[PDB]
Amino acid sequence: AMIVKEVYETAEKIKSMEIRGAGRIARAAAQALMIQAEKSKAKEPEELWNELKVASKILYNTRPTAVSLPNALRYVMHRVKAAYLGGADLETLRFTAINSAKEFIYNSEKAIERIGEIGAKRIEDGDIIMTHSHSKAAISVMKKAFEQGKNIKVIVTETRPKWQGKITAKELASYGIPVIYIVDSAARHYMKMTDKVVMGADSITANGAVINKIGTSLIALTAKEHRVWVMIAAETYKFHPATMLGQLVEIEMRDPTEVIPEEELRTWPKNIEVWNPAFDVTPPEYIDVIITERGIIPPYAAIDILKEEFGWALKYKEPWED
Amino acid sequence: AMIVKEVYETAEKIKSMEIRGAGRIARAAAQALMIQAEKSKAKEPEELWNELKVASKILYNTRPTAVSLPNALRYVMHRVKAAYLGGADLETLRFTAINSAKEFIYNSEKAIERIGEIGAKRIEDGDIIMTHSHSKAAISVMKKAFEQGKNIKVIVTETRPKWQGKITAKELASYGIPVIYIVDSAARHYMKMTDKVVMGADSITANGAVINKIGTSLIALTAKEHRVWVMIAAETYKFHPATMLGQLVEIEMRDPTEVIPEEELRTWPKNIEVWNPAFDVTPPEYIDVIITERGIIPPYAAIDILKEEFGWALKYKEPWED
Amino acid sequence: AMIVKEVYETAEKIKSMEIRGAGRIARAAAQALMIQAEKSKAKEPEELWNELKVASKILYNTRPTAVSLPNALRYVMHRVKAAYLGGADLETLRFTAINSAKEFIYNSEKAIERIGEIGAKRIEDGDIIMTHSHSKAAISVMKKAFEQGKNIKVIVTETRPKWQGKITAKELASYGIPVIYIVDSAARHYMKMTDKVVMGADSITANGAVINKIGTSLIALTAKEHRVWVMIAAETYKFHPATMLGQLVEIEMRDPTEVIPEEELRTWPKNIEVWNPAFDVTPPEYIDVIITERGIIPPYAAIDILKEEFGWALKYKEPWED
Amino acid sequence: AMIVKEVYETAEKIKSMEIRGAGRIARAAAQALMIQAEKSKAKEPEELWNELKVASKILYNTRPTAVSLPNALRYVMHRVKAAYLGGADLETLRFTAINSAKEFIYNSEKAIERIGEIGAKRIEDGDIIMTHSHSKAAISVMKKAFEQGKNIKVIVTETRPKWQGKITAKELASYGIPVIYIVDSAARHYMKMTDKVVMGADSITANGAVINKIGTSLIALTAKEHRVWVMIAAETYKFHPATMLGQLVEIEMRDPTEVIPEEELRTWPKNIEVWNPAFDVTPPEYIDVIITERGIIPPYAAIDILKEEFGWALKYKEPWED
Amino acid sequence: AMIVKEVYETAEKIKSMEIRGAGRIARAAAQALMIQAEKSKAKEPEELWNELKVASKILYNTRPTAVSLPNALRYVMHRVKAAYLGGADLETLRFTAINSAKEFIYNSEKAIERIGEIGAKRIEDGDIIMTHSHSKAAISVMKKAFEQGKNIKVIVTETRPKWQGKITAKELASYGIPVIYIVDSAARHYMKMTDKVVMGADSITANGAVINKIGTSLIALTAKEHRVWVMIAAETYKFHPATMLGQLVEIEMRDPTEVIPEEELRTWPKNIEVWNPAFDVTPPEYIDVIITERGIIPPYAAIDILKEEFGWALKYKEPWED
Amino acid sequence: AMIVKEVYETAEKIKSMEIRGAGRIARAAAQALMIQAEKSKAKEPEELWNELKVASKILYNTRPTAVSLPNALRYVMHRVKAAYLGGADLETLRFTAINSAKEFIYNSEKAIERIGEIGAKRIEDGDIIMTHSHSKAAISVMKKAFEQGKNIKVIVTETRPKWQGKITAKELASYGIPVIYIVDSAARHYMKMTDKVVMGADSITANGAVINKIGTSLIALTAKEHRVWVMIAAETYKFHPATMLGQLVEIEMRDPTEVIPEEELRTWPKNIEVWNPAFDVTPPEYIDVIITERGIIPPYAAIDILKEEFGWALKYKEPWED
Ligand SMILES: O=P(O)(O)OC[C@H]1O[C@H](OP(=O)(O)O)[C@H](O)[C@@H]1O
Ligand SMILES: O=P(O)(O)OC[C@H]1O[C@H](OP(=O)(O)O)[C@H](O)[C@@H]1O
Ligand SMILES: O=P(O)(O)OC[C@H]1O[C@H](OP(=O)(O)O)[C@H](O)[C@@H]1O
Ligand SMILES: O=P(O)(O)OC[C@H]1O[C@H](OP(=O)(O)O)[C@H](O)[C@@H]1O
Ligand SMILES: O=P(O)(O)OC[C@H]1O[C@H](OP(=O)(O)O)[C@H](O)[C@@H]1O
Ligand SMILES: O=P(O)(O)OC[C@H]1O[C@H](OP(=O)(O)O)[C@H](O)[C@@H]1O
Ligand SMILES: [Cl-]
Ligand SMILES: [Cl-]
Ligand SMILES: [K+]
Ligand SMILES: [K+]
Ligand SMILES: [K+]
Ligand SMILES: [K+]
Ligand SMILES: [K+]
Ligand SMILES: [K+]
């Protein structure tokens, strides 16, 4: 297959986390398929089809844990596949790929904006909010509540090992929001003063568990301990269809040199191993609501998002498979 | 008062954390009084007395949270004071200071060794142990259990912001113990596989609460959640006598540039504040036992350590005061 | 607009709580709109329409917390509105208002009878039931259980500040049911002997939370502590649509003189403030079942009742707005 | 009136537990109706219909608690009733019973295999699984995990008074799975080493509660204490439709001679009573997932299974009543 | 036999709660013995001793639950009994009663002031404190925190049926402290904004349980839920020695006309009963500290206070029995 | 050394559980040493001393878990030893052994009677008491409550594998107490109707944990869930000294053939292992009180009983060692 350089560049940037955040990654994958379609030099439909299948696999094999990425590839490829099997000519197949990618991308932006609006209504004037990592959907909530005139303060946890809390502190401060930055370890210490916890998600499972940046589950635990609301801001494409049929979500283990830089780690003795899980699992009992672009739900209604938006496709192979 | 340079050097090193760990700091303070006494050029008892009072205040005013430091200054100064008020001549007063310092120091070493022995009996072959920060008393437990032939593995949490888990990982690996190093955020994720949690203390209060490096309380919380034993290794001089009469332990807030280096932090916008608490409070309900050099106790018997070893002195002013 | 006096009297009696109980208020609001339509001297459908809009707003701005009231108003006005925009003439629009009102009222009555029948099957012979405030839905359950020949006793909590428990005690006693009256403070003390807790609702939110008379959340809390079933008897028009899109329910703050009579309160020092919340929020974790006229649900299925019955209207404005 | 011996023999065996297990009992009841219809000497439809009603009542009145039984009877008899009332002739009505009976049995067998496949995806290599009683649905899960090459071990509880763990132990060992057999009392002692709990169900109610062999609720309770996943393997026909309208599930009290054999019990004084409940109720807070043939659900989605699949029948009397 | 009117008047007032509060009642009983001894016309010791026994029994039989009362009586009468039995003459025995009575009263006053001083150190600037009933020991804590210049605010619960919160509110407001008065039912609603709970005690038992005004256990329960410190202010004579040997504390059931006044209650049907428990039991898991005149203790150290101070008397009958 | 046959028979009967119950074993071990001393044909004190040492070791190496046994052995041998090292002659050493044994036995009997009297005061008329295994201390409590005229009923759990519940049921029934026998699995199901749980102990550790018959921790767990008082009746010689210095109590693993008779177990597949723990560990959080012969304590005061009575001996070796 004649795969275009932008597909490989995208895959590499996803892998290395030059591009990151579950939504963003997913939009990047749809964008990559769009560019494979736009630039294909294929002359028959079967040839374009094969490129998009191959491009999809390349993209899918980058980072496993956030289901947004496969859900985006599915969104495009279900549509591409049905056009192809229905006899679509080259330019029709090309345009189905391009347009389906465009749709996912546009709907993703609209979903994140609407999560903002919906979530902002649960934020109250004076609230102190704690967050974790850097989630565009969580930030959309905080930014919108501030734009409505509510005087909020956000506590941002450092989010080791990649220091994602620095991204979030700078972003929220850029909008004029007062920020407090703390190490991850201090989240219990400051939970007494916190009014609301607002975090994102990478995957949400059929039983209502939320998989999100390493450390989410500790914050959610002590929030629950302290009767602080835990709200998860998450697009419908963060919900994980394969978990309806028993699949476990893989926790990505990333390079130990993200924790301890190479120059330092090579001096350490052989009997120290560094483990670097990028995500943990928060059980539904410590989540009060999930805020999707279609509304507020209890975590136990994740199964209904799934049943109604995704369950149909479970009969079939992945749309990129042979 | 003619205070000797070693007293100021000690105080500065305590303040900057060149010297750290609650036990160590306390031994350093006793050592500083010893050196003030050894080198004093005072000619009358009243003059030496005044130097030791002043030296004590200098030492006490360095770091507030670990009560080991004042308990060490008390150990020396109660004895110095009673000698002085009893009519002691210069050389007798000098020697009371020197010998009392020596005693605290020697007893501290013996206490930590014996905590090791006692605590090692609760560690079992095959155990996975999680720890936090760098505590010589906790390390004494782990090292001794390994010396008895038990195959253990220790999970060491990074302990931001000062990276104290690096000290501990290297130390335990140096003794031949297999170590796993994780960021603080991953402590819940790995609590399922952990058999025992072993941590130190800076102060232990009359109601049984343990004050220890920022993050201790999150680990203890999720340990309890998972029915993992939480054991606190702590010398009798980590117990906090003033809490018997209602005193609150001050949580040291340290420089924000320990979290975010100056070069970086000065570029950040004014509306981001960095908060850097060095300690948190773990409630007794999440501690199973405290291991002291006199035995195992439930956290609710802290009041008995206090009543019996320290309560006598509560009638009186601090022995360094006027 | 020529609003008839029954609309003003009804609003006044709601505000003053001369008429109270979430279902009863809702039937009264429907009954007011019915009377506006019956007596209107409008000649034009535009005129009647404008009256019913204004009557609606008058009724809506009485008490904020029980969503039964706006749900009644919507039941009548979604239909009046659809008729008006469809070109209904005067008599058709009038009958639409009058008939929609009567449908609401009749359904409300049936729904309470049916909640009785359903909930009674969960009451067992010999049961001690604790209740709170005065809820016709809850009373329907207890009364029906008694009519079935189950030997029950009901513990009635006083329900300060308005003493709603007195209403309940006398109503149940007049059906022949043995009653124990206690102060609200004694709810924990007698939860040991209690088999079941049966309470009503004013609003039920998307996430499963129940808003009911002040003190409900405490009884639910301690019931849960003691493993005593907490059953909320509540008609589907107690479910709150706007919470689907993130709205917080306003907690009504009533006059301090309802707590401390005027005559006594004026003698009190100025630095005393009396706070009088008429409702609190019981989280879904402390609720076993909601008994609706369509059946038993877990609290987390509240979002389903909302999606099924109310979701469709959230894209539109209020059916009494310009 | 003319009931074949196989109906009576099936009944007698259900009742004596010569045939037991909720699914198996349901299949036997469908079979017994099948055989009645095959062998009926009836000449007219009404006469066949009367036989099938009376047979249904005989089989319904064997054992109360497992809803699988009446659900099987309903499956056959709803379809039989509709053909009788729509005018079917003798052979059409015969065939409808036979074939409906066959469909239930086949669907039961496929549902157990599918539960296996879905549940096995939740089991990981190296897992220690605790189970209780003997459930073909739970065994299907464990069996399949093993066939996938996962190295698992199963802790089988004895399950007094009938010793159903013996069955489970021998069965799992015959497939190749190593087993640890313990008394019921030791379930907490071994919950520390357990990774997963997998049990079956007799009836699952509208609020998410699972009714299963005596002691299930204890294992679920300490599993929750220990953060061990509780998985319930259960077909859709284990869901109890009458609970949607408030029905309490009857817990079967079995003969005390299954606890203490007659010989011994007759020698005991009159003031000892032996109580022998065959089932207990596990509340949904202690269940993480139910694995059905349709997928994984939180227990709070039990109501959705009931609504989609069984609600419709609740207007109508039992399809075997006159 | 010759009992002065002041003993009977003191008794009558204790009983009617014209004099109430556990400490105050104890001081009154000591006073009443004092006055009996002052005014006795007895000529021989035996005759004085008989009067003091009979007076003691009269005062003991007023109100059961607060152990302060019999502890005051014992304080005086142990010392009186020992002087009578050691042969004291009339005036020596008179003086022993008078002076023992004076010592109890003075020690009570000093104990309340010291509790204040110790507890106030637990209150921080800006704290919202919730209290319940009217306790001079808890008020001493709050009063002193305010005198130290801490800006605090107190949430006072109403405390039905006797309205003791009115007393507390007015008293605290007179000292300068701002007060929020709420009904008992609203305690959970406002627990989110509360920093500390400070209540008193009538009896504290050997296992750490605190018996205090009806509703205390509810506030303690939701405080724990919310991680709000529960502090009990209580003198050593609130500790209940008979509980060391297994005695259950009697909970006083007071007249139903304090709940519903006679006028109203006589109009109620016979099948309503009003139950009026004056106290409940808070278990020690819901108490963080007891503040005594001797220091702060965990509630599990109640046994130590009992052992040191009261155990000795448990061999002997009551010092007022024949 | 010439060990008499009663020493060997006693050890054999302990090992086989022909004699069982922690108190009874302890009295039997004392009784054996008594018999060794009575019948010894030693001529020299060195000779008798050596016999009693060897008898002691034989008795100690029977069953490990109940510390009552070594505590009995120590009671006798601390005294025999002190006499020997003090130069006691043959007859003096013999009488020291015989008299120390008789003191142990008499005190044990008194202690159980006294535990009965104390614990009975915590039992109330109408109470349903659940017990587990067969404990003479627990039975002392129930029996005394009945003798006081309290109308109680006792739910007796079967206590597999040895059926110790049958012993209990028949013993209580023969005193006239109504008994309900249930399987261990039914403990949760009947905890609703239970007022109090009364169980014994084999060992109690420094941190407050109770080691008792397998299944104890489960009953305590669910009692705590249901807020049912958990009361452990236990003599001070059930308290375990070595736990003060970090020792873990060994859990006795008994023969698998006690669970599955030999005749049946030999037919079972090789990949089934039967595990038979005779005890489990109940954490102090699930225990309300320990009833000792010296009084009621919270579990966290176990360290006090140990410090008071046993601490002094921990610096010395076992009084039967070389
Ligand atoms: O989609 P949005 O809301 O931006 O992010 C969702 C989540 O994805 C990110 O993962 P990573 O940094 O890519 O590993 C973070 O865990 C974040 O919470
Ligand atoms: O006395 P050891 O057991 O060495 O240490 C006790 C505790 O003191 C240290 O504080 P810091 O690093 O001085 O702030 C850590 O918090 C550690 O756990
Ligand atoms: O609709 P029904 O079941 O009668 O009552 C529902 C609830 O509404 C009432 O409020 P209020 O007395 O109007 O403030 C009470 O809170 C009651 O529980
Ligand atoms: O249908 P399957 O999955 O085989 O079994 C489900 C349940 O039915 C059985 O009841 P019984 O032995 O008939 O009383 C056991 O309780 C078992 O868990
Ligand atoms: O001794 P002080 O601290 O004043 O009061 C302690 C307690 O005694 C009172 O009882 P009552 O009003 O006499 O029934 C209240 O329960 C109060 O909390
Ligand atoms: O000393 P007493 O109160 O009689 O019994 C105490 C405990 O010792 C017994 O063990 P075993 O039957 O010897 O294994 C039972 O566990 C019982 O609860
Ligand atoms: Cl049920
Ligand atoms: Cl009590
Ligand atoms: K908070
Ligand atoms: K673990
Ligand atoms: K109850
Ligand atoms: K486990
Ligand atoms: K709070
Ligand atoms: K109970």
User: What are the angstrom distances between the C-alpha of A308 and each of A202, A319, C305, F134?
Assistant: 20, 19, 16, 57
Q: Which fold has domain B110-310?
A: Rossmann fold (3.40.50)
Question: Which residue from F117, F121, F285 is facing E248, i.e. has the nearest CB?
Answer: F121
CA F291 – CA F113 distance, rounded (Å): 12
Q: Domains of chain A: which residue ranges?
A: 1-109+311-322, 110-310
- CATH architecture of the domain formed by C1-109+311-322: Up-down Bundle (1.20)
A297 contacts in chain C (CB < 8 Å): 206-207, 303
Which of D227, D190, D234, D228 minimizes the C-alpha distance to D211? Answer: D234
Task: Look up residue E101 and give its amino acid.
Answer: A
Ion ligand 13 neighbours (CB, 5 A) are: E 194, 228
- Within 10 angstroms of residue A44's Cβ, the number of other Cβ atoms is 11
Residue E45, token pair as written in the block? 């010791």
CB D237 within 8 A of CB D75: yes
CA A288 – CA C207 distance, rounded (Å): 7
Kindly state the helix (H) or strand (E) to which residue D22 belongs, with its residue range. Answer: helix D22-39
Give residue A262's Cα distance to chain centre: 28
CA F11 – CA F55 distance, rounded (Å): 9
CB B189 within 8 A of CB B180: no
CB B277 within 8 A of CB A189: yes
3-state secondary structure of C113: helix
- Encode C92-102: b = buried (16+ Cβ within 10 Å), e = exposed: ebbebbbebbe
F247 contacts in chain B (CB < 8 Å): 121
B301 contacts in chain F (CB < 8 Å): 300, 303-304
The binding-site residues of ligand 2, defined as CB within 6 angstroms of any ligand atom, are B 20-24, 66, 133, 135-137, 164, 200-202, 212-213, 278
CB A30 within 8 A of CB A219: no
DSSP strands (E only) in chain C: 128-131, 153-157, 179-182, 196-199, 203-204, 210-213, 229-233, 272-274, 279-282, 289-292, 295-297
3-state secondary structure of C291: strand
Interface of D with A in 117-176 (CB under 8 A): 117-122, 124
CB B249 within 8 A of CB B321: no
CA E22 – CA E201 distance, rounded (Å): 8
Q: How does DSSP assign F10-51, residue by residue?
A: HHHHHHTTSS-SHHHHHHHHHHHHHHHHHH---SSHHHHHHH
CA D100 – CA D79 distance, rounded (Å): 7
Which of B117, B120, B148, B116 minimizes the C-alpha distance to B135? Answer: B116
C154 DSSP β-pair partners? C129, C179
Q: Count interface pairs E-F at CB distance under 8 A.
A: 45
- Within 10 angstroms of residue B33's Cβ, the number of other Cβ atoms is 29
- Specify burial of residue D113 (Cβ count, 10 A radius: 0-12, 13-18, 19+): middle
CA C167 – CA E257 distance, rounded (Å): 18
Q: Is F149 left (phi over 0), alpha (psi -120 to 50) or beta?
A: left
Residue identified by tokens 């105050």 is E24
- Within 10 angstroms of residue B86's Cβ, the number of other Cβ atoms is 10
Q: How far is A242 from chain D (nearest CA, A)?
A: 10
On whether any CB of chain D is under 8 Å from the CB of A247, the answer is yes
F22-39 vs F5-15: helix crossing angle, rounded to 10: 170
Which of D63, D265, D260 minimizes the C-alpha distance to F182? Answer: D260
On whether any CB of chain B is under 8 Å from the CB of A280, the answer is yes
Helical spans, DSSP H, in E40-124: 45-60, 68-85, 90-120
Residue F68, token pair as written in the block? 């009552």
Task: Look up residue C19 and give its amino acid.
Answer: I
CA F272 – CA F270 distance, rounded (Å): 5
Query: In sequence order, which residues have a C-beta less than 8 Å from that of residue A207 and are 6 or more positions away?
Result: A243, A284, A300, A302, A303, D288, D289, D296, D297, D298
Check if C14 has its Cβ closer than 6 Å to any atom of ligand 3: no
Which of F224, F296, F237 minimizes the C-alpha distance to F76? Answer: F237
E227 DSSP β-pair partners? none
DSSP strands (E only) in C74-188: 128-131, 153-157, 179-182
- Within 10 angstroms of residue A256's Cβ, the number of other Cβ atoms is 16
CB B154 within 8 A of CB B184: no
| Cα C27 to ligand 1 centre (Å) | 49
Task: Point out the ligand 2 atom lying closest to the alpha carbon of residue B252.
Answer: 14
Check if A236 has its Cβ closer than 6 Å to any atom of ligand 1: no
CB A167 within 8 A of CB A183: no
CA E109 – CA B22 distance, rounded (Å): 41
Q: Is the CB of E246 less than 8 angstroms away from the CB of F120?
A: yes
Ion ligand 12 neighbours (CB, 5 A) are: D 194, 228
CA B127 – CA B122 distance, rounded (Å): 10
CA F226 – CA A245 distance, rounded (Å): 36
Instruction: Specify the experimental method.
Output: X-ray
CA C116 – CA C145 distance, rounded (Å): 8
- Encode F209-220: b = buried (16+ Cβ within 10 Å), e = exposed: bbbbbbbbbbbb
CA D158 – CA D166 distance, rounded (Å): 6
Strand order in the sheet with B279-282: B203-204, B210-213, B279-282
Which of F163, F116, F107, F156 minimizes the C-alpha distance to F136? Answer: F116
Question: Which residue from C118, C285, C301 is facing D246, i.e. has the nearest CB?
Answer: C118
Which of C101, C114, C23, C36 minimizes the C-alpha distance to C69? Answer: C23
CB A138 within 8 A of CB A200: yes
CA A237 – CA A35 distance, rounded (Å): 22
Interface of D with B in 201-230 (CB under 8 A): 225-227
D300 contacts in chain C (CB < 8 Å): 298, 300-301
CB D34 within 8 A of CB D96: no
